[PDB]
Amino acid sequence: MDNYFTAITLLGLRDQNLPPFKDARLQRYKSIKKMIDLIETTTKLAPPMPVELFMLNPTDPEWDDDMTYPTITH
Amino acid sequence: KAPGQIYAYDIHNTHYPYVNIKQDSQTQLLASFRRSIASINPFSYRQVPSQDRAAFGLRWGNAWYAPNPYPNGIHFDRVFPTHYDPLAETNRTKANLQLIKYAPGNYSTLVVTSEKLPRPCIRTIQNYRRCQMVNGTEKCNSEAQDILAICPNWALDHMKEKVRFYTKALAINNQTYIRAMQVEEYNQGRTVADVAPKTWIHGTRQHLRPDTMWADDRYTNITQTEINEAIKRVEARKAREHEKKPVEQANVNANTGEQPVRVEKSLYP
Amino acid sequence: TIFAETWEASEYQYRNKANLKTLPVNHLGKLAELKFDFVEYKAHQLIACHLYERMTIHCMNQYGLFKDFYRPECLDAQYYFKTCVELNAAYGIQKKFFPEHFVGSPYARPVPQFQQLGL
Amino acid sequence: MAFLSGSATYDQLADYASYNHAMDVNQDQQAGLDSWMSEKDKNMVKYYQRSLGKKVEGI
Amino acid sequence: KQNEYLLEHEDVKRYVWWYEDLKETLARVHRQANNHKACDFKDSEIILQDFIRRYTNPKDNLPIKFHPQGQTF
Amino acid sequence: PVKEGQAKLWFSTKEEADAYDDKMISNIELKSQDYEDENFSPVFNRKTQEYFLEPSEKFKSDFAELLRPLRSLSFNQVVDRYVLIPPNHTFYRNWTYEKFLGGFGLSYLILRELPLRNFYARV
Amino acid sequence: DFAELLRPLRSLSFNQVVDRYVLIPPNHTFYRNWTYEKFLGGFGLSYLILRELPLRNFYARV
Amino acid sequence: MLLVKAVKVLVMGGCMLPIAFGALGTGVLFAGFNVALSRNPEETESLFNNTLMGFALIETFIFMSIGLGFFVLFA
Amino acid sequence: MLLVKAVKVLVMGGCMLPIAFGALGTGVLFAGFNVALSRNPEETESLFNNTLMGFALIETFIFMSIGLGFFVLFA
Numbered sequence A: 001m002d003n004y005f006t007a008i009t010l011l012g013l014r015d016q017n018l019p020p021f022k023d024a025r026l027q028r029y030k031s032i033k034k035m036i037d038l039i040e041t042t043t044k045l046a047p048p049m050p051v052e053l054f055m056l057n058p059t060d061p062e063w064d065d066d067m068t069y070p071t072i073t074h
Numbered sequence B: 001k002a003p004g005q006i007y008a009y010d011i012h013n014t015h016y017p018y019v020n021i022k023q024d025s026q027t028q029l030l031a032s033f034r035r036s037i038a039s040i041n042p043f044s045y046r047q048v049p050s051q052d053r054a055a056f057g058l059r060w061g062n063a064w065y066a067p068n069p070y071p072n073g074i075h076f077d078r079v080f081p082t083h084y085d086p087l088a089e090t091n092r093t094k095a096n097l098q099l100i101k102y103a104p105g106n107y108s109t110l111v112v113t114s115e116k117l118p119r120p121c122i123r124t125i126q127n128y129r130r131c132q133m134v135n136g137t138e139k140c141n142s143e144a145q146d147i148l149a150i151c152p153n154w155a156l157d158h159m160k161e162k163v164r165f166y167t168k169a170l171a172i173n174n175q176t177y178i179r180a181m182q183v184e185e186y187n188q189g190r191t192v193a194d195v196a197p198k199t200w201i202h203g204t205r206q207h208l209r210p211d212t213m214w215a216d217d218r219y220t221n222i223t224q225t226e227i228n229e230a231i232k233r234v235e236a237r238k239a240r241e242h243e244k245k246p247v248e249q250a251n252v253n254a255n256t257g258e259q260p261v262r263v264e265k266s267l268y269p
Numbered sequence C: 001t002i003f004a005e006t007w008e009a010s011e012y013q014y015r016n017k018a019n020l021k022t023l024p025v026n027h028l029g030k031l032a033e034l035k036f037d038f039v040e041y042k043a044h045q046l047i048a049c050h051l052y053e054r055m056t057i058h059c060m061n062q063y064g065l066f067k068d069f070y071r072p073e074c075l076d077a078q079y080y081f082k083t084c085v086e087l088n089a090a091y092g093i094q095k096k097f098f099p100e101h102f103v104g105s106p107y108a109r110p111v112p113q114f115q116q117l118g119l
Numbered sequence D: 001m002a003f004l005s006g007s008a009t010y011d012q013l014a015d016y017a018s019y020n021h022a023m024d025v026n027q028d029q030q031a032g033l034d035s036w037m038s039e040k041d042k043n044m045v046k047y048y049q050r051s052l053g054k055k056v057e058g059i
Numbered sequence E: 001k002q003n004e005y006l007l008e009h010e011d012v013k014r015y016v017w018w019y020e021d022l023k024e025t026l027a028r029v030h031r032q033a034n035n036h037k038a039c040d041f042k043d044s045e046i047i048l049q050d051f052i053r054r055y056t057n058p059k060d061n062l063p064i065k066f067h068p069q070g071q072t073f
Numbered sequence F: 001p002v003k004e005g006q007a008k009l010w011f012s013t014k015e016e017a018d019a020y021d022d023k024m025i026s027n028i029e030l031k032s033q034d035y036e037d038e039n040f041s042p043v044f045n046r047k048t049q050e051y052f053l054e055p056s057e058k059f060k061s062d063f064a065e066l067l068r069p070l071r072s073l074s075f076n077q078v079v080d081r082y083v084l085i086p087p088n089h090t091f092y093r094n095w096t097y098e099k100f101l102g103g104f105g106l107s108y109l110i111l112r113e114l115p116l117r118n119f120y121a122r123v
Numbered sequence G: 001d002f003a004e005l006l007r008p009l010r011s012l013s014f015n016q017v018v019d020r021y022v023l024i025p026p027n028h029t030f031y032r033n034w035t036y037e038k039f040l041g042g043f044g045l046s047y048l049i050l051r052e053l054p055l056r057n058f059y060a061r062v
Numbered sequence H, I: 001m002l003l004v005k006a007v008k009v010l011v012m013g014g015c016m017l018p019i020a021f022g023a024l025g026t027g028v029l030f031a032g033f034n035v036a037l038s039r040n041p042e043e044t045e046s047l048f049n050n051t052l053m054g055f056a057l058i059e060t061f062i063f064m065s066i067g068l069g070f071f072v073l074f075a
C-alpha cells in the first residue's frame, strides 16, 4: 500500500466520509487507479542537479586517510 | 564557549521535563513536585539531550517506556502451538521461554540498503569513465581489463545485477507510463481547452456534495409522503432498466482438486 | 497501492526468503482504549493505516501535544500510524519492482513453456 | 401478532441481528452516516443466510 | 568557497521550475464528481498528461529514459 | 421538499439530478421520537447530520507552538543555531548515566544504616 | 514575543474569534466589585488579627 | 453487539443483590450477638470478635460480586 | 452469536444470586455460633472450627456457580 496520503486524499477522506455500503465504497477505491499511475509517473520526471552540492564526494582520495574520532576517556 | 542546545530545548526551555507515561495519581503528583525542584534537586535526571550532557528517555513509573511493538504475527513455538494473534491483546505479553519466541526487531522497519564496493575497485571505475569522456570508449580497453581483474568477483556480480534490476525497473516505469497516458473512452477528443477552471477545493465538501444523505441539510425537509412518491418514480425507471441482466457464467473453480483462481470475492458471504 | 480494504496475507509474504514480518489488518482493539468519547464510523477502520491516523487526530483534539498527549493509548496510535505507512510504503514498492519475491506471483517460481521440456 | 404468528419472521430478524456487518452499518446510520443502497447491498442478509446453508432465492 | 559556483548552474533553476510546475499542476487537480468511477477525475487526467507530455515524448520506444542520476523510486 | 445549498451535485442535466434525489429519498427511513407518528422509534433514532473529522483549535495551536523559535529566525540563523553547532568533544556526556545509576550505590550507603531494630524489617 | 501574543488567534477563524472574545453572552449578575471588597476589606480583617499581638510593650505595638 | 453492552451494564446492576442480602445477613448476625451476649456476658469479647469476623466473610461476597460485575462490565 | 452472546453474559449475572444467599447463610450461621457459644462456652474451639467449616460449604456453591458461569459463558 504505497502512495497512502495521495490515495487517502483522492478518496476525499480529508473532507468527507466514504459510503457505508461495500458496493460503492469499493468502486471508489478502484476509481483512483488511473490517477496513481499518473502521479507516480510525474514524480519520475525530475531533472538532475549537481550531486556535489550538499554532499562531498566520498570517493575522493582526500578521504583515504581513514581517520578515527579522537575521544577523551573520562 | 557555551554548550549547544537542540531544538527541543527551546520548546520546553528546560532539561528536566519530568515526563512519565504512567497515568496514576502517585506518578503525576510526584512528577509535578519533581518538575518544580529540578533546579536544586540532586536526584534530577535530564530528559532533553545536549552537546555537553546526554539524557534519558521517557519514564514509565520507576522503569522506562517504549511503545508496544507494531503487531507481527510471526512467532516460534517451543512446547505447543500457541496460535499467537497480535490483534487479540492490547499490550504484547512477555515471551516465556517454554511458550513462544517473537520475531526479531521489536522496533524495526523495512528498508533497502546497498553494500559499498571496495575502494580500489571504485578507483578503476573512476579511471574508466574519465578516460571514456576524454579519449572515448574505443580507447579504454586497458582501464576495462583493470576493472575485471582488480575488482573481486562478488563485486562484478553486483555490477552485473544492477544493470538487470534497473532494466527491470525501467520497464515497470514505462508500463505505468503507458497506462497513465492512455486516453479512455470518456476523454476521446478532449484537450486542455475542454478543462474547467477549477481547483482542488472545488471538489471538496463545501463545493461538491458527497454521496450521502446527511452530509448537509438537503434532505432534512423531506416527508414520508414525498418518499412514497419517490419510490414510485424509481420503480417506474426500473420498468425499463430491469429488462436486462448479465448471464450467469461457469464456475472456473468448480473442481476442488485444481488450483483455484484468485477471483474477486463477493461483497457479502 | 492497495485498492481495497482487505488483502490476502500470503500475497505479502516472501516465497524464497524467511518471513519475519506480516502485513496485519488494523488493530481494532486499540480503539477501545481511548477513555474519552469520540465518533468513529465502521466504514473507515479496515483501510490500511487510516484508523491509526484518525485515532491520532482524536487524541490530538481531546489532548494536545504537551504533558497530556503523553499517555500510552495515544502514543501507541501515533507510533502505529507512523510505522504502518512506512511498512506499507516499502511493501508497496517491493510489490512494484520486486513482485517475484512474494507468494502468489507466477515469477517467484516460473512454470516453463512446453517447448522447454523436449517432447 | 403478525410477527409472533409467523414462522420466518423470527429468522429474518435473527439472521439480520446476528450479521455483525449489517449491525455495523446500522450503528453508522444511527450516528448520521447513511446513503442509498444497490440491489446487491439490499440482499446482504440473503448472502449471510446462504453461507450458513439456508435455502434463499431472489439474490 | 571552492564549490560555491555550482549553485550558479542553470540546472538548479531548471530543477526549481519543474518543482513549481508540479505544485501548480497538482493544485489544479480536482474531483469532478462522486459517482465512484474513474470519470470522477476526468479533467484531471488531461492536466497531468499535459505535464507528462511536457517533459517526455510519448511517441518513443521508451518515453522514460534511464540515467544514473534519475528517478526509480 | 429538496433544499439547496453551497454543496452542489455533479450532474449536467436536471433529469439525472432528479433521478439522484429520487434514489436517495426512496432510501430515507424517518425515525421520530414523538408518539402517535407513523415513523416512531424510541431507541435507534437515526441522526440526520453527518459527522466530519477535522483538526480542532487545540490541534492547530500546538503544532504552531512547536515552530515558535523558527518564525523569529531566518534560514541562515536556524542553520547556525541548531545545525552548525561548534564541535566540542571534550564534555563528559555520559555523566548523566553515571550520576543516575551511581546513586544506587551512594543510596545503599545511607540506606544500609537505617536504625530499624528488627533485622527482618530491613530485609 | 509579538508572534507569541497572537498564538490563540492563529488556531481560530474570524467567526470563532468574534464568538470567543467579542460576542461574550451578556450576564450582569456577577459581583464584579468583589475583587476590591476582598482586597480592601482585608485591612479590617487584618486589623482584627493584628490588634491582638502579644507584644508586651505598648509602644512596640505603636 | 450494542445489546451485549446493554446487558453487561444490566448485569452490573444485579451485583446489588448480594449487597441487599449482606445487609440482612449482618442485621441477623448482630441480632443473635445481642441475645447471645445477654445469655453469657462473661465472654463479651469472644462473641464480639466472632461477630465482626463473620461480617468480614459477608463483605467477601460483596467484593467478589462487584469484582465480577466490573469484570463482566469490561470483559 | 452476538445475539446468543448477549443472553450468555446475562446468564453470567445470575451467578451473583448465590453470592447473595451465601452472605445471608453466613450471617445466619455465625449468629447460631454466637448464641450457641453463650449457652455452652466450654467447647468454644469445637464450635469455632465447625463454624468456619460450615462456611466452607457456602463458598462451595459460590465457586461452583462462577465456574458454571464462565463455562456456559464460553461453552
Ligand SMILES: CCCCCCCCCCCCCCCCCC(=O)OC[C@H](COP(=O)([O-])OCC(O)COP(=O)([O-])OC[C@@H](COC(=O)CCCCCCCCCCCCCCCCC)OC(=O)CCCCCCCCCCCCCCCCC)OC(=O)CCCCCCCCCCCCCCCCC
Pocket (backbone or CB within 6 Å): D010, D013, D014, D017, D026, F031, F040, F041, F042, F043, F044, H002, H003, I003, I010
Ligand atoms: C431467565 C429469566 C429472567 C430474565 C427476564 C428478562 C430477560 C431480559 C433480557 C432480554 C430477553 C430478550 C429480549 C430482548 C428484546 C430486545 C429489546 C431491545 O433491544 O430494544 C429494542 C426494541 C426495538 O427498538 P425500536 O425503537 O422499536 O426500533 C425502531 C427502529 O425503527 C428499528 O429500525 P432499524 O432500521 O433501526 O433496525 C434496528 C435493528 C436493531 O437490531 C437489534 O438491535 C437486535 C435486537 C435484539 C433482538 C433481535 C432478535 C429478536 C427476534 C424476535 C424474537 C423475540 C422473542 C422475545 C422472547 C421474549 C422471552 C420471553 O433491528 C431492530 O430494530 C430489532 C427490533 C427488536 C425487536 C425485539 C423483539 C420484540 C419483542 C416483542 C415482545 C415485546 C415484549 C415487551 C414486554 C415488556 C415488559 C416490560 O425496543 C423496544 O422494544 C422498546 C420496548 C417495548 C415498547 C414498550 C415499552 C416497554 C418498556 C419496558 C421497560 C422495562 C424494561 C425491562 C425491565 C425489567 C426489570 C423490571
Ligand SMILES: CCCCCCCCCCCCCCCCCC(=O)OC[C@H](COP(=O)([O-])OCC(O)COP(=O)([O-])OC[C@@H](COC(=O)CCCCCCCCCCCCCCCCC)OC(=O)CCCCCCCCCCCCCCCCC)OC(=O)CCCCCCCCCCCCCCCCC
Pocket (backbone or CB within 6 Å): B034, B037, B040, B041, B042, B043, B044, B045, B062, F099, F100, F101, F102, F103, F104, F106, F107, F110
Ligand atoms: C539544621 C538541621 C537540618 C534542618 C533542615 C531539615 C530539612 C532538610 C531538607 C531540606 C534541605 C535538603 C537539601 C537538599 C535539597 C533536596 C530537596 C528535595 O526535594 O529532595 C527530595 C529528594 C529527591 O526527590 P526525587 O526527585 O523523588 O529523587 C528520589 C527518587 O527516589 C529518585 O528516583 P530515580 O529513579 O529517578 O533516581 C534514582 C536515584 C537513586 O535514588 C534512590 O535509590 C532512593 C530510592 C528510595 C529508597 C528505596 C525505597 C523506597 C522508599 C519509598 C518511601 C520513602 C518515603 C520517604 C519520604 C520522605 C519525604 C521527604 O539515583 C539518582 O537518580 C541520582 C542520585 C545520586 C545523585 C547525587 C546525590 C547527591 C546527594 C548529596 C547528599 C548531601 C547530604 C549528605 C548526605 C548524608 C551524608 C552522611 O527525595 C528525598 O527525600 C531523598 C532522600 C534521601 C535520604 C537523604 C538522607 C540524608 C539527608 C541529609 C539532610 C541534611 C544533613 C543532615 C545531617 C544530620 C543532622 C541534621
Ligand SMILES: CCCCCCCCCCCCCCCCCC(=O)OC[C@H](COP(=O)([O-])OCC(O)COP(=O)([O-])OC[C@@H](COC(=O)CCCCCCCCCCCCCCCCC)OC(=O)CCCCCCCCCCCCCCCCC)OC(=O)CCCCCCCCCCCCCCCCC
Pocket (backbone or CB within 6 Å): G038, G039, G040, G041, G042, G043, G045, G046, G049, G050
Ligand atoms: C494544627 C496547628 C497548625 C499547624 C499548621 C502550621 C502552619 C500554618 C500556616 C499554613 C496554614 C495557613 C492557612 C491559610 C493558607 C495560607 C497559605 C499562604 O500561602 O498564605 C500566605 C499569606 C499570603 O501571602 P501574601 O501574598 O504576601 O499576602 C499578604 C500581603 O501582606 C498582602 O498584601 P496586599 O497589598 O497584596 O493585599 C492586601 C491584603 C491585606 O493584607 C494585609 O493588610 C496584611 C498585612 C500584614 C500586616 C502588615 C505588617 C506586615 C509587616 C511585614 C512582616 C510581617 C511578617 C508576618 C509573618 C507571618 C507568618 C505567617 O488584602 C488581600 O489581599 C485579601 C485579604 C482578605 C483575606 C481574608 C482572610 C482569608 C484567610 C482565611 C481566613 C480563615 C483563617 C482563620 C482565621 C484566622 C485565625 C482566627 O501570608 C500570610 O499569611 C500573611 C500573614 C497574615 C496573617 C495570617 C495568620 C493566620 C495564622 C492562622 C494559623 C492557623 C490557625 C491557628 C489555630 C491555633 C490552634 C491550633
Ligand SMILES: COC1=C(OC)C(=O)C(C/C=C(\C)CC/C=C(\C)CC/C=C(\C)CC/C=C(\C)CC/C=C(\C)CC/C=C(\C)CC/C=C(/C)CCC=C(C)C)=C(C)C1=O
Pocket (backbone or CB within 6 Å): G041, G042, G043, G044, G045, G048
Ligand atoms: C436587639 O436589641 C438591640 C441591642 O441589644 C440590646 C443594642 O445594643 C442596640 C444598639 C446597637 C449597638 C450598641 C451596636 C452599635 C454598633 C455600631 C453602631 C456599628 C459597629 C461597627 C463596628 C464595630 C465596625 C465593624 C467593622 C468590621 C466588622 C469590618 C472589619 C472586619 C472585617 C473586614 C472582618 C470580616 C468580617 C466578616 C466576614 C463578618 C463575619 C463575622 C465574623 C465574626 C468573622 C470573624 C473572623 C475573624 C478572622 C475574626 C439596638 C439598636 C438593638 O436593637
Ligand SMILES: CCCCCCCC/C=C/CCCCCCCC(=O)OC[C@H](COP(=O)(O)OCCN)OC(=O)CCCCCCC/C=C/CCCCCCCC
Pocket (backbone or CB within 6 Å): A074, B052, F090, F091, F092, F093, F095
Ligand atoms: C582532595 C582531592 C582528591 C582527589 C583525588 C586524588 C587524585 C586526583 C587525580 C586527578 C586526576 C585528574 C585528571 C583529569 C581527570 C578528568 C576528569 C573529568 O574529565 O571530569 C570531567 C567532568 C566535567 O564535565 P564537562 O564540562 O562535561 O567536561 C569538561 C572538561 N574540561 O567532570 C565530571 O565528570 C563531574 C563529576 C566530577 C567527579 C564527581 C564529583 C562528585 C565528587 C564526590 C565527592 C563530593 C561529595 C560532596 C558533593 C556535594 C554534593 C552536594
Ligand SMILES: CCCCCCCC/C=C/CCCCCCCC(=O)OC[C@H](COP(=O)(O)OCCN)OC(=O)CCCCCCC/C=C/CCCCCCCC
Pocket (backbone or CB within 6 Å): G029, G030, G031, G032, G034
Ligand atoms: C455577610 C452576611 C452573612 C449572614 C447574613 C444572613 C442574612 C442572609 C440574608 C441574605 C438574603 C439574600 C440577598 C441576596 C444576597 C446577594 C449576595 C451577593 O450579592 O453576592 C453574591 C456573590 C456571588 O458571586 P457571583 O458569582 O458573582 O454572583 C452570582 C449570583 N448568582 O458572592 C460574593 O460576592 C462572594 C463573597 C461572598 C461573601 C464572602 C464571605 C467573606 C468571609 C470570608 C471568610 C470565609 C473563610 C475563608 C477561608 C478561605 C480559605 C481559602
